[PDB]
Design a protein around this ligand. Structure first.
Ligand SMILES: CC(C)CCCCCCC[C@@H](C)CCC[C@@H](C)CCO[C@H](CO)COCC[C@@H](C)CCC[C@H](C)CCC[C@@H](C)CCCC(C)C
Ligand SMILES: CC(C)CCCCCCC[C@@H](C)CCC[C@@H](C)CCO[C@H](CO)COCC[C@@H](C)CCC[C@H](C)CCC[C@@H](C)CCCC(C)C
Ligand SMILES: CC(C)CCCCCCC[C@@H](C)CCC[C@@H](C)CCO[C@H](CO)COCC[C@@H](C)CCC[C@H](C)CCC[C@@H](C)CCCC(C)C
Ligand SMILES: CC(C)CCCCCCC[C@@H](C)CCC[C@@H](C)CCO[C@H](CO)COCC[C@@H](C)CCC[C@H](C)CCC[C@@H](C)CCCC(C)C
Ligand SMILES: CC(C)CCCCCCC[C@@H](C)CCC[C@@H](C)CCO[C@H](CO)COCC[C@@H](C)CCC[C@H](C)CCC[C@@H](C)CCCC(C)C
Ligand SMILES: CC(C)CCCCCCC[C@@H](C)CCC[C@@H](C)CCO[C@H](CO)COCC[C@@H](C)CCC[C@H](C)CCC[C@@H](C)CCCC(C)C
Ligand SMILES: CC(C)CCCCCCC[C@@H](C)CCC[C@@H](C)CCO[C@H](CO)COCC[C@@H](C)CCC[C@H](C)CCC[C@@H](C)CCCC(C)C
Ligand SMILES: CC(C)CCCCCCC[C@@H](C)CCC[C@@H](C)CCO[C@H](CO)COCC[C@@H](C)CCC[C@H](C)CCC[C@@H](C)CCCC(C)C
Ligand SMILES: CC(C)CCCCCCC[C@@H](C)CCC[C@@H](C)CCO[C@H](CO)COCC[C@@H](C)CCC[C@H](C)CCC[C@@H](C)CCCC(C)C
Ligand SMILES: CC(C)CCCCCCC[C@@H](C)CCC[C@@H](C)CCO[C@H](CO)COCC[C@@H](C)CCC[C@H](C)CCC[C@@H](C)CCCC(C)C
Ligand SMILES: CC(C)CCCCCCC[C@@H](C)CCC[C@@H](C)CCO[C@H](CO)COCC[C@@H](C)CCC[C@H](C)CCC[C@@H](C)CCCC(C)C
Ligand SMILES: CC(C)CCCCCCCCCCCC[C@H](C)CCCCCCCC(C)C
Ligand SMILES: CC(C)CCCCCCCCCCCC[C@H](C)CCCCCCCC(C)C
Ligand SMILES: CC(C)CCCCCCCCCCCC[C@H](C)CCCCCCCC(C)C
Ligand SMILES: *C/C=C(C)/C=C/C=C(C)/C=C/C1=C(C)CCCC1(C)C
Ligand SMILES: *C/C=C(C)/C=C/C=C(C)/C=C/C1=C(C)CCCC1(C)C
Ligand SMILES: *C/C=C(C)/C=C/C=C(C)/C=C/C1=C(C)CCCC1(C)C
Lengths: 222, 222, 222
């Protein structure tokens, strides 16, 4: 299509789809109940992403939002994806360290607020207010990163993989509010095609890279 | 109303409503925790359907989608219903065979993708792309039917009822992508009033017929 | 803003936000798994409300609905809030009395129907039909209040707090259908600024007042 960002959407669609099939094939025959949980979640997440990348590529998950007296192309389909895939990724971490239910509920809830307020900010027509939603969303993220960092005698296999995945999460998830802030949803200092490229690298890493790391460890088996 | 399909929407509303009250009255006094689970789920599903059938009948859950240079009446309220009722129906099956959590998550997730992509296809304005979403949705269905068929020492009561309900599911759920494909959302070979009739027969059978079968068995009691 | 109701939206935003921070600080250091559950839920609920009150205050969660040949300002963001916060409040009650899963599913499901049909009624352009949805929603509420009242050897600490919270719920939740009926969504006998004031008092009481009562009791600790 005309959209210069189409290539990264196409590339993203392809990588999420290939990752989904890879994880699909890999989890064939798994019988341990616990490992079954992890395979399901690490397969499901890129499958969801695949469908939302495809909707962006085909133009379905795109809308125009007026602000700054301009018509800004806003890919809303990303929030539909993240609404489901970021709590699932947090579930991966929680199952790992066998987090208490109370804590899981806190994380999932903070995470819904994070994506929900990001969506509202993405769709808000008063320019100044967009950043108010960005700030509240960011606070929710910080809450999450805090709990993953200061809320957690587990087998050394668990601890070792958790620490890695936890560091991956903090680094990758922290870049999203920055990309949004500088990209077309925020200050618009970075054009949409480079922003889409950034999100594509982050998403594949956060979903497929993260899943490859998770599924290579024995911490997932009972 | 003018809509020739109104009669099947009215009939559907009436049957889902009557079924809901029947199951409501039937589950009065149930005290076994396990049977309590099944009654809740088989009552809830037609109650949801009732509300979405009523919204279609009153015109609320209907929208026009441009494609093929025409204005196509698309009942979106069906996906709102199915989004909640098809995972609940799969939960009925999973509780039955006491499925592992990992597997339940896989089914619910595949099922959300199934209905979500069906909705996107239903609302897509580029005619060709509608069938791409139909295909992805169909693949998700096939995944589900596979797991219900090849992923499952349970009491012979369980196995016997499961097998019946499993065969009911495969037969009825498999007809939906065909109806959509030939009906107004797809190729438009079948007019909307006959399509609405088809979906009404499928839905009542899949919800009320299925629930009557489930609740007649002793497999639901501990 | 011009909207006379802005003050109650501002006040509501402020009270939900202050309550969220209060509960946030209060649950610091909690380590009992059970109490952890309650803190999460009573903190999450006002945090959600905060974001939806802010969206109403900034104008995002407001839409105009034609009916009675007028353009009626409808705050849809309330249903987005209630969709998540009313089942969470019911979860508080269920955890308390250690309700069976079957029953929890029934309550959450009835509750989704309650808010979902209230939303449909809120957005319905045929005046007469709005009250049909109000009636179905009200029936769902009555179902819920029934189960909380007639569906429940627990420690006397549990029973004592449950009874209080149960009476709070019945009184406060019962006022919502009345406010809606007499307010701008229904008969329009009460102007929108007084209606917003009513909902603000109900919401803070149902979320912050309710949470303060819940967290003062020892029934929440194992
Ligand atoms: C829990 C725990 C935490 C709860 C967090 C509280 C915050 C909730 C706020 C939410 C509000 C949603 C806003 C949106 C639905 C309203 C759509 O209106 C748009 C903006 O006026 C219209 O623009 C154009 C429309 C654009 C399209 C938007 C699509 C989006 C939908 C993504 C959700 C998915 C649902 C899966 C459906 C199948
Ligand atoms: C934000 C706080 C941290 C949290 C509290 C939330 C409330 C405050 C929201 C931020 C807010 C004002 C930013 C206002 C930008 C302001 C310079 C707009 C100036 O007017 C310009 C011309 O009329 C807008 O045109 C368009 C010019 C654009 C190119 C300028 C982009 C604006 C930038 C805003 C960046 C805010 C991020 C720092 C916050 C980083 C922390
Ligand atoms: C943007 C990327 C960083 C690019 C830099 C290239 C790699 C840099 C790695 C960053 C980090 C990884 C550090 C290694 C880790 C190892 C820590 O293990 C510790 C042992 O208990 C864990 O506790 C304590 C762990 C502590 C670790 C906290 C991680 C830091 C978080 C980095 C912020 C994020 C990125 C900010 C966004 C930016 C891209 C705009
Ligand atoms: C999980 C696990 C799996 C996740 C699956 C990934 C796929 C997610 C895709 C979803 C995207 C939803 C699309 C839709 C919300 C966007 C609405 O915009 C329409 C099409 O441009 C506008 O046309 C006219 C609008 C029409 C109205 C559409 C209504 C529908 C809403 C049904 C959902 C219900 C929510 C209950 C609310 C109370
Ligand atoms: C589909 C694959 C199995 C999965 C891969 C998904 C990508 C392919 C999507 C299918 C796609 C082209 C079908 C294209 C229909 C094509 C004949 C359109 C021809 O142009 C016509 C006039 O311009 C369209 O008018 C309107 C004419 C309409 C009356 C014709 C209806 C089209 C039919 C499409 C049927 C596809 C189903 C076979 C797939 C069954 C498997
Ligand atoms: C089989 C596997 C996917 C097949 C790959 C094909 C990709 C299509 O190539 C281009 C046409 O030359 C797509 O642009 C054509 C313009 C449009 C783009 C459509 C390409 C995507 C719709 C295809 C993405 C995967 C599809 C998924 C079909 C369902 C799946 C379950 C088999
Ligand atoms: C459209 C309907 C079929 C109308 C036909 C009228 C009744 C036909 C029954 C279809 C089927 C039922 C067969 C009986 C079953 C009994 C199988 O029990 C087996 C014992 O282990 C289960 O394992 C193995 C079980 C295997 C059974 C697989 C079921 C088949 C699936 C049928 C496809 C669907 C319908 C295709 C849609 C069509 C309507 C366009
Ligand atoms: C379960 C168990 C029980 C299921 C209950 C069955 C009843 C389900 C019905 C639901 C249907 C939702 C209606 C709505 C999504 C359709 C939007 O269209 C509006 C009315 O035509 C357009 O007006 C203007 C649009 C207005 C905006 C509406 C926003 C609302 C969205 C609130 C949901 C939130 C989702 C969190 C997203 C992040
Ligand atoms: C409702 C039953 C209990 C449950 C069954 C649901 C189906 C019935 C829905 C109620 C319905 C007719 C109410 C119809 C109101 C009727 C007086 C409208 C008269 O026409 C007026 C001028 O054309 C409407 O203008 C506007 C005039 C407005 C100011 C009048 C407001 C209408 C009021 C409706 C109140 C219904 C509540 C009693 C139900 C309390 C129980
Ligand atoms: C009591 C039970 C339902 C009563 C049945 C009545 C059905 C209405 O008959 C027709 C008027 O002659 C409806 O068309 C009138 C035009 C419009 C159609 C409205 C009919 C539906 C709105 C009624 C469907 C059931 C209602 C649910 C009221 C709430 C329920 C919880 C009691
Ligand atoms: C509108 C408010 C009531 C304003 C009135 C000011 C305080 C009045 C309190 C109302 C009620 C509280 C009664 C005390 C309670 C104590 C009951 O304890 C019992 C011991 O087992 C619980 O079983 C049995 C418990 C039984 C209690 C049922 C509660 C009643 C429900 C009241 C209806 C609601 C309000 C109707 C809405 C109105 C505002 C339009
Ligand atoms: C066999 C294994 C290792 C995995 C196969 C699954 C295939 C799909 C995608 C593989 C790539 C992901 C690796 C994670 C890390 C990265 C930072 C990815 C950034 C993406 C950019 C494009 C790079 C090239 C690729 C096409 C693999
Ligand atoms: C007492 C029992 C058996 C159930 C009572 C609940 C009432 C509601 C609906 C009953 C019908 C459902 C039977 C399932 C099978 C079918 C294939 C249904 C197809 C629907 C078409 C209309 C048929 C007539 C009816 C009004 C029952
Ligand atoms: C320290 C404790 C008690 C709580 C602090 C949290 C602060 C936030 C809100 C506190 C108010 C809620 C009490 C519940 C009961 C009421 C009926 C509230 C009705 C609201 C109307 C405004 C009243 C004044 C207030 C600003 C507290
Ligand atoms: C699968 C993709 C992942 C892991 C996406 C993560 C996304 C975030 C952490 C997004 C965060 C945001 C905020 C903190 C600020 C507002 C905007 C968002 C939604 C981009
Ligand atoms: C309560 C009703 C039930 C059991 C509905 C089942 C619906 C399906 C299995 C729908 C499947 C679809 C696809 C496989 C293809 C695309 C279109 C759908 C959504 C009709
Ligand atoms: C956090 C706020 C709470 C506890 C809100 C409770 C809301 C209700 C009980 C709403 C009920 C409604 C009906 C019974 C009738 C139709 C309209 C509603 C949605 C206001």
């Amino acid at each position: 299509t005309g959209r210069p960002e189409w290539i990264w959407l196409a590339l993203g669609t392809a990588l999420m789809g290939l990752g989904t099939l890879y994880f699909l094939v890999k989890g064939m025959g798994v019988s341990d109940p616990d490992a079954k949980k992890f395979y399901a979640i690490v397969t499901l997440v890129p499958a969801i992403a695949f469908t939302m990348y495809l909707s962006m590529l085909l133009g379905y998950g795109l809308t125009m939002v007026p602000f700054g007296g301009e018509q800004n192309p806003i890919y809303w389909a990303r929030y539909a994806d993240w609404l489901f895939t970021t709590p699932l990724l947090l579930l991966d971490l929680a199952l790992l360290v066998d987090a208490d239910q109370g804590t899981i509920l806190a994380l999932v809830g903070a995470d819904g607020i994070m994506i929900g307020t990001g969506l509202v900010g993405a769709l808000t027509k008063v320019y100044s207010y967009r950043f108010v939603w960005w700030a509240i969303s960011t606070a929710a993220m910080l809450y999450i990163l805090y709990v993953l960092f200061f809320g957690f005698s587990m087998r050394p296999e668990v601890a070792s993989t958790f620490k890695v995945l936890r560091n991956v999460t903090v680094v990758l998830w922290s870049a999203y509010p920055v990309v949004w802030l500088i990209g077309s949803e925020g200050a618009g200092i970075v054009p949409l095609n480079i922003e889409t490229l950034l999100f594509m690298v982050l998403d594949v890493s956060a979903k497929v890279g993260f899943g490859l790391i998770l599924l290579r460890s024995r911490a997932i088996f009972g």
